[PDB]
Amino acid sequence: SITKYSESAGPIGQSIYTFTGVTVPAQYMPRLVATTTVNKAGTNIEYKIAVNYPLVSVVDGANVALNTIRANLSFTALQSVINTDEKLRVLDEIVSFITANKANIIDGNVLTVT
Amino acid sequence: SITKYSESAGPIGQSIYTFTGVTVPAQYMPRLVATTTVNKAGTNIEYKIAVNYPLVSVVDGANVALNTIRANLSFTALQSVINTDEKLRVLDEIVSFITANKANIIDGNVLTVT
Amino acid sequence: SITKYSESAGPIGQSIYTFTGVTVPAQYMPRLVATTTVNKAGTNIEYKIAVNYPLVSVVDGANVALNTIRANLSFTALQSVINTDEKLRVLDEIVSFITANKANIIDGNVLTVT
Amino acid sequence: SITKYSESAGPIGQSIYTFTGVTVPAQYMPRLVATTTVNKAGTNIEYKIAVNYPLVSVVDGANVALNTIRANLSFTALQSVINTDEKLRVLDEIVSFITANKANIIDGNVLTVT
Amino acid sequence: SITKYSESAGPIGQSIYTFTGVTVPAQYMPRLVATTTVNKAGTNIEYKIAVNYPLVSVVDGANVALNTIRANLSFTALQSVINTDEKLRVLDEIVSFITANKANIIDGNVLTVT
Amino acid sequence: SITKYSESAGPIGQSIYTFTGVTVPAQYMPRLVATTTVNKAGTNIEYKIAVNYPLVSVVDGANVALNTIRANLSFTALQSVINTDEKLRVLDEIVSFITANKANIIDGNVLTVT
């Protein structure tokens, strides 16, 4: 559930999406930002997913972000080879691990939940 | 589909898993490593998920990893607030985005696949 | 009444327990930490018990530890000799003294309560 | 089982007790010493419980203390807040932990005895 | 029959174990120490097993170790090739040889016992 | 399962044994070499067990050993004191540890397998 805010013109660029539920001034609006950056050598492209979620509170009549929840992901989409099966294996294993151990990732616990 | 190789002693530590299907020597074994690290100030703990997938090839009759697929993912499990709903929102939104746009993430493509 | 959080792998290590009654974000969760450290010479091991109890209050929408109640204990478990009767004498006399003069220890009063 | 040797004049001071069963010269007499000391800022007073148990042995026909069992225990009786329930919680939890795991504390063993 | 003394939280570290049957002061307690060390090139890990068994004796009312039984073992767990049947064969053959010829190994006798 | 290759006629010498199962040219045949060497003072004899397992490979129609699995073991058979139960205890404990944790010894992993 994210609403589009900035779409990249092409596949190499930056897209910015806002969280749907929150109704808070735009500086402290929680956002998800995807960013493809091409290596200087052109060997690979790096895909970067950056989620910020400010925990607002009101002081002296204005919103302030006491703390902020952040989550970042970086994937090296190699352009030197096409290994789509293996590249997908990587993303799939990350997603499977998160969804399986979500309850412990939230509490900062590396142990497997079983 | 990952096989456990080393589990952490406590909730703050490092756990190492190997990829199941891959049968290669351990030097080129693709792995997923989770690591919780405590901030110096103790304000949050950080969860790190690091996957290395070395692409084994043979040059001059020798095993060499010409390229390597790497993927990192960090989450700030804040310890200064318990906002489990918000942290879940963050982690779920990033997982959902990765699953939805996976086919383009692997190619270095920031556009949404729709 | 303490709930286990980190258990040491072996007898030389560190265990961390959390207080049961309190429901407060994990940074300001009151904890008891036991730690065995081996002397460089290997003459004795030191057992260290460290209790922190932060007195939380909410300001500007976030918890802060105005003050903190701390209590520390250190015992020299000599490894050069086995004098179990005497070592136990030491711990027992400390415990007996605390339980007897608890009311005055709390108020910072060295006088015997009688 | 301790015999009083010196009581403090006021609530802030030093009291000295000797171990009852031990009948040795005063130079090697095991003792328990309580000492309240006021913080410079006056924010808290600190309660210190120090036990020395010298292990008397005989070398070349002379009394020498080859080793000594020492144990220290400090408590921050905060003067900036009266949180008697919380201070009691701290002191009780540490005493209960020592009593429960005493058999392993004496051996330099951090594992819980269960 | 050995119990834990110190177990590294990482798969590459140093674990220490103490012998069970011996009842002496723990400084002179017989021990077994396993240690994995990684090659600078990352070609192999070396596994090291070191057993020390101090022969405690009493002189002039003091505990000293006139002699000490030591046994060292090293293994090259190659990471560049997985030949697992062959690594297991090496360990199995060395274990079988020690068990079979133990009676003469303790005597400094290289001859086969049959 | 090893057959003899060279057995010293003296109780203090060097015996060589070859592995049974392997079918390769005998220069690259895997071997176990036991060696007793006497101390200059005659205080102890050192028993040495050296296993080499060459990994034979074929390059350009030639037999070469790209890598080699080695395992070394040493034991101090003290001649100045007969503590035979204790020497046997050392050998038994090291053998028991290898047999139990073999699965992780071959992987360069110091952690206990349970």
Side-chain angles (χ1 to χ4, degrees):
Chain A
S1 64
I2 52 172
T3 301
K4 306 184 164 179
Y5 175 64
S6 296
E7 278 181 359
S8 176
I12 302 309
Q14 182 181 350
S15 295
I16 309 172
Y17 305 100
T18 59
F19 280 8
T20 51
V22 180
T23 55
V24 155
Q27 175 189 6
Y28 309 99
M29 182 71 73
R31 300 203 290 191
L32 157 62
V33 170
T35 299
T36 48
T37 51
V38 175
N39 198 359
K40 185 180 177 181
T43 52
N44 87 345
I45 299 172
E46 198 171 5
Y47 200 98
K48 300 173 182 179
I49 291 168
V51 183
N52 59 355
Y53 193 105
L55 308 172
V56 299
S57 58
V58 55
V59 303
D60 294 336
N63 288 111
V64 297
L66 46 102
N67 289 110
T68 304
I69 304 179
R70 292 172 186 170
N72 296 318
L73 183 130
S74 67
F75 179 72
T76 67
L78 310 159
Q79 304 274 283
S80 50
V81 297
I82 42 160
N83 268 114
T84 39
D85 283 335
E86 292 75 35
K87 304 186 199 171
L88 281 151
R89 178 73 175 275
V90 172
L91 283 180
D92 283 328
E93 290 300 340
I94 296 182
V95 169
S96 177
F97 179 90
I98 306 151
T99 52
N101 300 303
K102 187 179 307 183
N104 285 334
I105 296 175
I106 294 299
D107 287 332
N109 186 345
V110 67
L111 295 170
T112 72
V113 56
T114 51
Chain B
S1 62
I2 49 179
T3 300
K4 302 179 177 179
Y5 178 63
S6 302
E7 290 181 2
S8 176
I12 300 162
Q14 182 179 354
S15 296
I16 306 173
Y17 314 97
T18 58
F19 282 9
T20 49
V22 180
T23 57
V24 300
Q27 183 183 6
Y28 311 104
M29 175 67 71
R31 297 191 300 173
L32 158 57
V33 170
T35 301
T36 49
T37 48
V38 178
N39 195 2
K40 183 178 178 182
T43 54
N44 95 346
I45 183 168
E46 198 176 359
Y47 203 97
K48 301 175 181 180
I49 287 173
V51 173
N52 58 352
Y53 196 106
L55 300 176
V56 181
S57 50
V58 284
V59 293
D60 290 333
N63 283 324
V64 172
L66 290 181
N67 290 107
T68 300
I69 306 177
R70 291 178 190 169
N72 188 6
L73 168 73
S74 63
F75 179 69
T76 67
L78 291 162
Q79 306 269 283
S80 49
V81 284
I82 40 161
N83 278 350
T84 49
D85 293 315
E86 285 79 355
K87 309 176 186 170
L88 279 175
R89 179 67 181 278
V90 173
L91 197 54
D92 286 328
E93 284 299 338
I94 186 173
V95 173
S96 178
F97 181 90
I98 297 159
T99 53
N101 299 304
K102 187 171 42 185
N104 286 335
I105 298 168
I106 57 159
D107 290 330
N109 184 344
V110 71
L111 297 170
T112 51
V113 50
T114 52
Chain C
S1 64
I2 52 172
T3 301
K4 307 184 164 179
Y5 175 64
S6 296
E7 278 181 359
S8 176
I12 302 308
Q14 182 181 349
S15 295
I16 309 172
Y17 305 100
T18 59
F19 280 8
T20 51
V22 180
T23 55
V24 155
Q27 175 189 6
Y28 309 99
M29 182 71 73
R31 300 203 290 191
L32 157 61
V33 170
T35 299
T36 48
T37 51
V38 175
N39 198 0
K40 185 180 177 181
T43 52
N44 87 346
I45 299 172
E46 198 171 5
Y47 200 98
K48 300 173 182 179
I49 291 168
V51 183
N52 59 355
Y53 193 105
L55 308 172
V56 299
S57 59
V58 55
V59 303
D60 295 336
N63 288 111
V64 298
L66 46 102
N67 289 110
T68 304
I69 304 179
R70 292 172 186 170
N72 296 318
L73 183 130
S74 67
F75 179 72
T76 67
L78 310 159
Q79 304 274 283
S80 50
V81 297
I82 42 160
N83 268 114
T84 39
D85 283 335
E86 292 75 35
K87 304 186 199 171
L88 281 151
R89 178 73 175 275
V90 172
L91 283 179
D92 283 328
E93 290 300 340
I94 296 182
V95 169
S96 177
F97 179 90
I98 306 151
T99 52
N101 300 303
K102 187 179 307 183
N104 285 334
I105 296 175
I106 294 299
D107 287 332
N109 186 345
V110 67
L111 295 170
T112 72
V113 56
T114 51
Chain D
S1 62
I2 49 179
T3 300
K4 302 179 177 179
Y5 178 63
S6 302
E7 290 181 2
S8 176
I12 300 162
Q14 182 179 354
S15 296
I16 306 173
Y17 314 97
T18 58
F19 282 9
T20 49
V22 180
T23 57
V24 300
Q27 183 183 6
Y28 311 104
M29 175 67 71
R31 297 191 301 173
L32 158 57
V33 170
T35 300
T36 49
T37 48
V38 177
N39 195 2
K40 183 178 178 181
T43 55
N44 95 346
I45 183 168
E46 198 176 0
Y47 203 97
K48 301 175 181 180
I49 287 173
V51 173
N52 58 352
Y53 196 106
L55 300 176
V56 181
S57 50
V58 284
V59 293
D60 290 333
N63 283 324
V64 172
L66 289 181
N67 290 107
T68 300
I69 306 177
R70 291 178 190 169
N72 188 6
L73 168 73
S74 63
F75 179 69
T76 67
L78 291 162
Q79 306 269 283
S80 49
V81 284
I82 40 161
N83 278 350
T84 49
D85 293 315
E86 285 79 355
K87 309 176 186 170
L88 279 175
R89 179 67 181 278
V90 173
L91 197 54
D92 286 328
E93 285 299 338
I94 186 173
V95 173
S96 178
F97 181 90
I98 297 159
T99 53
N101 299 304
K102 187 171 42 185
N104 286 335
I105 298 168
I106 57 159
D107 290 330
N109 184 344
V110 71
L111 297 170
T112 51
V113 50
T114 52
Chain E
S1 64
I2 51 174
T3 56
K4 294 180 177 179
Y5 184 86
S6 166
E7 177 177 356
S8 69
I12 295 158
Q14 172 171 337
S15 293
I16 310 171
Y17 309 106
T18 58
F19 284 11
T20 55
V22 179
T23 55
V24 297
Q27 180 183 5
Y28 309 97
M29 181 73 70
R31 288 190 279 184
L32 161 58
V33 172
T35 303
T36 51
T37 49
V38 182
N39 193 3
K40 186 176 178 180
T43 52
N44 85 337
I45 301 176
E46 200 181 358
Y47 204 102
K48 299 174 182 179
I49 289 176
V51 182
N52 57 356
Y53 192 104
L55 304 178
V56 182
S57 58
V58 284
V59 298
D60 291 333
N63 282 323
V64 301
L66 292 178
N67 290 105
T68 298
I69 304 178
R70 292 176 186 174
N72 296 318
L73 174 81
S74 66
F75 180 80
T76 64
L78 305 156
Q79 306 284 323
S80 52
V81 294
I82 44 155
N83 296 139
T84 52
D85 295 322
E86 295 80 351
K87 307 169 181 173
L88 295 176
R89 174 77 182 274
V90 174
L91 286 180
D92 283 330
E93 284 300 339
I94 187 170
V95 161
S96 178
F97 183 91
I98 303 160
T99 50
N101 298 303
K102 186 176 43 177
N104 282 125
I105 295 173
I106 61 162
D107 282 339
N109 185 3
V110 69
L111 298 174
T112 65
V113 55
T114 48
Chain F
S1 64
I2 51 174
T3 56
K4 294 180 177 179
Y5 184 86
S6 166
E7 177 177 356
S8 69
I12 295 158
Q14 172 171 337
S15 293
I16 310 172
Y17 309 106
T18 58
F19 284 11
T20 55
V22 179
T23 55
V24 297
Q27 180 183 5
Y28 309 98
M29 181 73 70
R31 288 190 279 184
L32 161 58
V33 172
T35 303
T36 51
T37 49
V38 182
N39 193 3
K40 186 176 178 180
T43 52
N44 85 337
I45 301 176
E46 200 181 357
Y47 204 102
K48 299 174 182 179
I49 289 176
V51 182
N52 57 356
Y53 192 104
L55 304 178
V56 182
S57 58
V58 284
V59 298
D60 292 333
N63 282 323
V64 301
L66 292 178
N67 290 105
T68 298
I69 304 178
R70 292 176 186 174
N72 296 318
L73 174 81
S74 66
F75 180 80
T76 64
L78 305 156
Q79 306 284 323
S80 52
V81 294
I82 44 155
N83 296 139
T84 52
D85 295 322
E86 295 80 351
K87 307 169 181 173
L88 295 176
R89 174 77 183 274
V90 174
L91 286 180
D92 282 331
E93 284 300 339
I94 187 170
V95 161
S96 178
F97 183 91
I98 303 160
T99 50
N101 298 303
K102 186 176 43 177
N104 282 125
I105 295 173
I106 61 162
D107 282 339
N109 185 3
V110 69
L111 298 174
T112 65
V113 55
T114 48

